[PDB]
Amino acid sequence: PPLPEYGGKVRYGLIPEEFFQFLYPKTGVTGPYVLGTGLILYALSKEIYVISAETFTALSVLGVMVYGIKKYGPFVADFADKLNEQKLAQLEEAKQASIQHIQNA
Amino acid sequence: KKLLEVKLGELPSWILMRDFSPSGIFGAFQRGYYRYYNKYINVKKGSISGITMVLACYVLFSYSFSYKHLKHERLRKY
Amino acid sequence: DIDTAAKFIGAGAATVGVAGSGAGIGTVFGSLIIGYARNPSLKQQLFSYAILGFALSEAMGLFCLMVAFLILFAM
Amino acid sequence: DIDTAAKFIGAGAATVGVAGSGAGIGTVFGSLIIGYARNPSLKQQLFSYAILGFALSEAMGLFCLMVAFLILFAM
Amino acid sequence: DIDTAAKFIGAGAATVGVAGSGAGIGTVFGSLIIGYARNPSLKQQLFSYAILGFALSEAMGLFCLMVAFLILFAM
Amino acid sequence: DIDTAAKFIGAGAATVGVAGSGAGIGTVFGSLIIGYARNPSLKQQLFSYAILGFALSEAMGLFCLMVAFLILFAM
Amino acid sequence: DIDTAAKFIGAGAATVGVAGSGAGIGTVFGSLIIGYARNPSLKQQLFSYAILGFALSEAMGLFCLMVAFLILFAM
Amino acid sequence: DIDTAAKFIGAGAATVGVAGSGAGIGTVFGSLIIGYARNPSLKQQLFSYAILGFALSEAMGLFCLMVAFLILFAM
Amino acid sequence: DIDTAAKFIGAGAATVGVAGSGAGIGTVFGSLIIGYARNPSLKQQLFSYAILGFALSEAMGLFCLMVAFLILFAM
Amino acid sequence: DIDTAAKFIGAGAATVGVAGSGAGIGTVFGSLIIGYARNPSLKQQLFSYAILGFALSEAMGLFCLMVAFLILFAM
Amino acid sequence: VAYWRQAGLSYIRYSQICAKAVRDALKTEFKANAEKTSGSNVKIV
Amino acid sequence: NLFASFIAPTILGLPAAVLIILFPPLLIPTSKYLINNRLITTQQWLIKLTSKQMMTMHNTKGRTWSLMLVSLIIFIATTNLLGLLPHSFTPTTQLSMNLAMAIPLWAGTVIMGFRSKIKNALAHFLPQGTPTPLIPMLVIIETISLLIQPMALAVRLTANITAGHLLMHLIGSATLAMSTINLPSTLIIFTILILLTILEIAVALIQAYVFTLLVSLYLHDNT
Amino acid sequence: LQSIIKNIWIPMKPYYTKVYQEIWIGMGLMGFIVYKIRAAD
Amino acid sequence: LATFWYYAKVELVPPTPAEIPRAIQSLKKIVNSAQTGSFKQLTVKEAVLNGLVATEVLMWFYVGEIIGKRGIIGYDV
Amino acid sequence: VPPVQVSPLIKLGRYSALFLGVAYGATRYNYLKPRAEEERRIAA
């Protein structure tokens, strides 16, 4: 069975487009965003999210992750695609080779 | 026709019609894993979002059990 | 209270012993510079050794820190 | 009384540990001089290796300043 | 009351002696790097020596740590 | 009373740590001599690196002295 | 008692003299690696020297450990 | 009466930091020997560099000695 | 009493100074290995120098031990 | 009562600093071995430098001993 | 391994370039005889 | 207070450490296909590179541990990397888990060396050309080395990972404590924290590789 | 019992029975050490 | 930028005085459906959607609270 | 992407909740500052 060609259309690497489409009818385009900002402000206002040293280690590792992704993402995607293309080319070559061998026989 | 998937079925009896067995919960978790995997990971030309979403859920879980320690670091009292 | 005082003193003393790992890591990476300047076509394998060397010499220093904490928090 | 005294002594003993960082930096940059005199065309790679070695020696010194501050403030 | 304090201080002092093994492991693996950059055909035997050297140098450090524990826990 | 005494002891312990910068400057200038004897045409760039080395290693030593004085007078 | 306390601290101090033997074993085996990379046809002779060097460096270290015990147990 | 005792012990500690300058001068002049054996026609400039390196290492050692003498006499 | 306590502590501290002898012996015999691998025709004379070097570095360590036995047993 | 005890402890701590001259002498004579195994016709001048280097490295050690004998006896 | 050997050259080509450079820097009183004495004339088949 | 991130986590009273230790293999999906997605492609390339690195130096009997050593390095590296995320609990900071990883493998290698190989197993404690008057001493040394190898394994992992985390946390506190004070100094401390984060990623991978390489060498000395 | 030992124990049998025997002895040793540690605590 | 406002002018604005009767009628419809228990006709999809919108308006209330105590984190005193 | 004229009920609820939040925030700020000062003084 062949795989699809694209994934699930995530936004910001965290939330899929299905959520934005699901809130589009009742709360429009800014609905999900005001829900997100409201939840963030309620979390860090009622001190559900306690600001500590882990906030800054979190910001550091998230910055390193976003930078590393934006930088070495094209390279890793192209590397995987080229690995698959080389394997496919080698396989097609080795199939035609045996066809030619039996035709020669 | 009470096999209606949740998000389509309004009833509480549906809640008790499900297979709340160890094998049933195992099948439920495995079906969820394969739904996520087929939607986000098991595609060609896939994205890194299928991993960063897992890592975000992991960080949320990690914060959940780290709250009993952080609630002593709150900077207000109410 | 003399026990906590000696805990602080012994923790500082135990921490002294990380100078060895600092110096040994300097040695490992300086030798990496040299050996790479002599045979740059081996840059990969040489670097591997450097990593290994680093990970071992640093190890010793952390042992010191271990004792430091064993003295400072776990008596 | 005696606890703050021991805190000062332990802070001094813990900051002793960056002597190794100083010696390792000396070794790294001396080996950089040597390796550059050998192969003066790899100036950039040799300098990058020297920067890496210097950073790692400074990390081994940071592991001593950590215990210095854990003695001095967070007993 | 005072002897436990001296046990803490003596254990810290005794574990200071792991700096030598840190530096010695640094030297061993730096020289492995250099000697392999000079003659990469002996990569195995050279590496063997390194391990030997490491396993001996580190040994001394453990000696120190041994005494540290023998002052901190046994007597 | 005892606090000033431990301040003296801690400043002495902290200034023990300039030995690393002494050894590192020794290493840097020895390697400058060696690398200039090998490639005396790089006399300028070599010296630059030596300067840089003497600027970093000594810095570490200076840090120690700073800490020492910070224990002796300020905090 | 205060004499046994100082026995602990003095043994812990005298144990630091093993850092020298650790660093010296590191140096002897790094130089064995380098001398075998240079002239691999003397692997026997070199190695003999190596052990001899080791046997001497560790010797000094042992003295320190010995001294330590002769402050902890003898007197 | 505890201040004078602390000054003695802190001055001993402070003067420990001369071992670094000793080892650094040893390194500078050993490298002078090696660099003169390779290129015996740069003897004057190699000796100039050796004088500079020895001056800086001795300077660090004298900083340690003068901190010791500042503690011991001038508080 | 306090004086015999300090005698134990000072003997241990004085004994610490054998680390330099250990490291120097290691350096001397490692350089003997290297110089014999390079010019095996000079072996005899090289060994001579090694002996001399050894006999000198150890001598320094001996002084340290002397001071130890000057404190622990004589004065 | 405490001054003589602190004098013993400071004398030990001060005579610790001979490790630097021990290591420096080891380096000087190892470099003599190497530089002579390279170009033996210079054996005189090489040895001359060694002596000089020796007499300077050991010089630092004496300073340490001086302070020891300044603390132990002259005060 | 020098930079030119990494680039695939040889010591014969290195020597050739270095000798040609030393010849180009000769004052013209010696230059003609120098380029005649060391010039190649063989052709490859 | 300071070691709060190394305490066995519990959510609603249950040992969440079990889930945290079972999670790493979930990030390695496998497939029967011949040409599959980018994640499995990159992971299979990495696993092949790792196997060739770790296992080429072994003979036919040491190469039976390919599965074991590749599983060890993958498990440790993924655990150490997942320990870098915010608020996470890293099980490799625990001396219990690291002792249970180190003692079985080292003991298995030495018992494999004493079952077969017994002549060479007992001969290994003495180097080949050791001079005579030193034969006793070098047997007291080597022996204790063989007896500290397991502990010095576990500790070397624990003491490292723990320490790294501690350092980062402390620097984090610094930034927080400096947020209400001079902001350029806060940015300098934050840049130190970023460099430390990159160093901690490197150390995660390096510690996985070094634990596995030392186990591999103990195996190589007994096959 | 079915489809578990078909997907867990049939693949891992060559290793559990032949390759890791010494690992199993060493794991017994580790359990003994851990019992001595927890009991003296 | 400005697209935020392009959507906010239609969505994130207060209700004009002309459409408050519509809101009153909708509130009456909701309370009537709650009275007669007719909400058993609402699939859990739409139930979740309504719950999310109610959570959003509660977050509006809490944002109004943080703008009414002049301090974001907790209570400044 | 076209906007959505949201339901006037949701809109009125949004803004009424916001204003009630402003009210409650000011109210509890004034309710809590005296007790806070009282506790900070009695803690000395």
CB of L85 less than 8 A from some CB of B: yes
Element (H, E) at F4: helix F2-15
Distance from CA of J26 to the nearest CA of H (A): 8
Q: Decide: D53 and C26 in contact? Cβ < 8 Å.
A: yes
Nearest to D9 among F9, F17, F26 (CB): F9
L221: number of Cβ within 10 Å: 17
Distance from CA of L141 to the nearest CA of E (A): 7
Give which of L1, L11, A38, N72 is closest to B67, Cα–Cα: L11
Supply φ then ψ for residue L14, to 5 degrees. -105, 155
Radius of gyration of the CA atoms of chain J, in A: 17
J75: number of Cβ within 10 Å: 14
Bridge partner list, A35: none
Structure tokens at L143: 């022996």
d(CA L210, CA G1): 46
- The DSSP-derived string for J8-69 is HHHHHHHHTTHHHHHHHHHHHHHHHHHHHHH-GGGHHHHHHHHHHHHHHHHHHHHHHHHHHH
Residues of L in contact with B50 (CB under 8 A): 39
Supply φ then ψ for residue A15, to 5 degrees. -125, 130
Radius of gyration of the CA atoms of chain K, in A: 13
Q: Decide: L179 and L222 in contact? Cβ < 8 Å.
A: no
Residue of C nearest to F18 (CA): C19
User: Reduced to 3 states, what is the DSSP secondary structure of residue C18?
Assistant: coil
User: What single-letter DSSP state applies at residue N70?
Assistant: S
I57: number of Cβ within 10 Å: 33
Q: Decide: H29 and H55 in contact? Cβ < 8 Å.
A: no
Identify how the structure was determined: cryo-EM
d(CA L121, CA L126): 10
Q: Residue D46 class from Cβ within 10 Å (0-12 exposed, 13-18 middle, 19+ buried)?
A: buried
d(CA A3, CA A1): 7
Tell if the CB–CB gap between L152 and E59 is shorter than 8 Å: no
Q: Which amino acid type is present at position L195?
A: L
d(CA C41, CA L126): 36
Distance from CA of L87 to the nearest CA of G (A): 39
Q: Which amino acid type is present at position D43?
A: K
**Beta-carbon contacts of residue L104 (< 8 Å; ≥ 6 apart):** M23, M26, M27, M29, M30
Which residue's structure tokens are 């001599």? F33
Sign, CA dihedral F67-I18-G21-D33, equals positive
Query: For chain A, which chains pass the contact test of at least 3 CB pairs under 8 Å?
Result: B, L, N, O
User: What single-letter DSSP state applies at residue N74?
Assistant: S
N57: number of Cβ within 10 Å: 22
User: Reduced to 3 states, what is the DSSP secondary structure of residue B44?
Assistant: coil
Phi-psi category of residue B45: left, alpha or beta, with phi > 0 → left and psi -120 to 50 → alpha: left
Resolution of the experimental structure, in angstroms: 2.5
| Helices A17-27/N44-66 angle, 10° precision | 80
Bridge partner list, L14: L11
d(CA L176, CA A57): 10
d(CA C57, CA C32): 15
Supply φ then ψ for residue F51, to 5 degrees. -50, -55
CB of E64 less than 8 A from some CB of G: yes
A86: number of Cβ within 10 Å: 10
Tell if the CB–CB gap between B41 and L37 is shorter than 8 Å: yes
Residue of L nearest to G44 (CA): L129
Which residue's structure tokens are 């934006």? A70
d(CA C48, CA L210): 11
Residue of C nearest to D18 (CA): C19
Give which of I34, G59, I48, I24 is closest to J25, Cα–Cα: I24
Structure tokens at C35: 């050996």
d(CA C7, CA D70): 12
Distance from CA of I51 to the nearest CA of E (A): 22
User: Reduced to 3 states, what is the DSSP secondary structure of residue G74?
Assistant: coil
Residues of I in contact with G18 (CB under 8 A): 19, 22
Tell if the CB–CB gap between H9 and J6 is shorter than 8 Å: yes
Give which of F8, H17, G58, H12 is closest to I71, Cα–Cα: H12
Distance from CA of L221 to the nearest CA of M (A): 15
CB of H19 less than 8 A from some CB of I: yes
Mutate to test the interface with E, among C44, C63, C66, C73 (most CBs of E within 10 A): C63
**Beta-carbon contacts of residue E51 (< 8 Å; ≥ 6 apart):** L217
Tell if the CB–CB gap between A28 and O3 is shorter than 8 Å: yes
Q: Which amino acid type is present at position E69?
A: F
Sign, CA dihedral A18-A22-A23-A25, equals positive
Tell if the CB–CB gap between O29 and N77 is shorter than 8 Å: yes
User: Reduced to 3 states, what is the DSSP secondary structure of residue B53?
Assistant: helix
Residues of N in contact with O30 (CB under 8 A): none
Q: Decide: D7 and C10 in contact? Cβ < 8 Å.
A: no
Q: Decide: I26 and G51 in contact? Cβ < 8 Å.
A: no
Give which of I12, L145, E49, L203 is closest to C62, Cα–Cα: L203
Sign, CA dihedral E73-E75-F6-F7, equals negative
Q: Decide: F61 and H59 in contact? Cβ < 8 Å.
A: no
Cα H14 to Cα H7, H23, H66, H69: the distances in Å are 10, 17, 9, 9
Structure tokens at J71: 């603390």
d(CA K30, CA K23): 9
d(CA O6, CA O15): 13
d(CA L162, CA L83): 10
User: Reduced to 3 states, what is the DSSP secondary structure of residue A11?
Assistant: strand
Q: Residue A42 class from Cβ within 10 Å (0-12 exposed, 13-18 middle, 19+ buried)?
A: buried
Mutate to test the interface with G, among I7, I8, I60 (most CBs of G within 10 A): I8
Half-sphere exposure of A6 (CA within 13 A, CB side): 3
Tell if the CB–CB gap between A24 and O4 is shorter than 8 Å: yes
Sign, CA dihedral N19-N21-N22-N28, equals positive
Mutate to test the interface with E, among I1, I9, I34 (most CBs of E within 10 A): I9
CB of D33 less than 8 A from some CB of L: no
d(CA G13, CA I15): 8
- The DSSP-derived string for chain L is --SGGGS--EETTEETHHHHHHSGGGG----S-SS--HHHHHHHHHHHHHHHHHHTTS-TTGGGGHHHHHHHHHHHHHHHHHTTSTT---GGG-HHHHHHHHHHHHHHHHHHHHHSSHHHHHHTTS-TT--GGGTTHHHHHHHHHHHHHHHHHHHHHHHHHHHHHHHHHHHHHHHHHTTTS-HHHHHHHHHHHHHHHHHHHHHHHHHHHHHHHHHHHHHHTT-
Residues of chain D by 3-state class (helix, strand, coil), percent to 5:
90, 0, 10
Sign, CA dihedral G63-G68-G71-G73, equals negative
CB of C60 less than 8 A from some CB of E: yes
CATH architecture of C2-73: Up-down Bundle (1.20)
Cα L156 → chain centroid: 8
**Beta-carbon contacts of residue K1 (< 8 Å; ≥ 6 apart):** C39, C40, C41
- The DSSP-derived string for C32-53 is HHHHHHH-GGGHHHHHHHHHHH
Structure tokens at H23: 């080892």
Q: Residue F65 class from Cβ within 10 Å (0-12 exposed, 13-18 middle, 19+ buried)?
A: buried
Beta strand segments in chain J, E: none
d(CA I11, CA G68): 10
Bridge partner list, N64: none
> What is the domain partition of chain I in residue ranges?
2-73
Structure tokens at D65: 């300043």
Residues of H in contact with J31 (CB under 8 A): 29-31, 33-34
Strand bridging mode A10-11 / A15-16: antiparallel
Residues of E in contact with I23 (CB under 8 A): 20
Residues of N in contact with A39 (CB under 8 A): 55, 59
| Helices L183-220/A53-104 angle, 10° precision | 50
Bridge partner list, A15: A11
d(CA H25, CA J52): 11
**Beta-carbon contacts of residue F33 (< 8 Å; ≥ 6 apart):** H28, H31, H32, H34, H35, H46, H49, H50, H53
CB of B47 less than 8 A from some CB of A: yes
Cα L9 to Cα L6, L20, L22: the distances in Å are 8, 9, 14
Which residue's structure tokens are 């540690």? M37
Residue of I nearest to J69 (CA): I67
Structure tokens at N8: 């906010």
Nearest to L167 among D56, D63, D74 (CB): D63
- The DSSP-derived string for H9-24 is HHHHHHHHTTHHHHHH
Which residue's structure tokens are 């890592």? B55
Cα N12 to Cα H31, H52, L107: the distances in Å are 76, 74, 68
CB of H48 less than 8 A from some CB of F: no
Tell if the CB–CB gap between B9 and N44 is shorter than 8 Å: yes
Tell if the CB–CB gap between B75 and A14 is shorter than 8 Å: no
Strand bridging mode L14-15 / A10-11: unpaired
Q: Which amino acid type is present at position L16?
A: A
d(CA L172, CA L2): 12
CB of L68 less than 8 A from some CB of M: yes
Distance from CA of N62 to the nearest CA of A (A): 6
User: Reduced to 3 states, what is the DSSP secondary structure of residue K28?
Assistant: helix
Nearest to F71 among D8, D18, D31 (CB): D8
d(CA F35, CA F43): 9
Structure tokens at N54: 């109610």
**Beta-carbon contacts of residue A66 (< 8 Å; ≥ 6 apart):** none
Bridge partner list, L10: L15
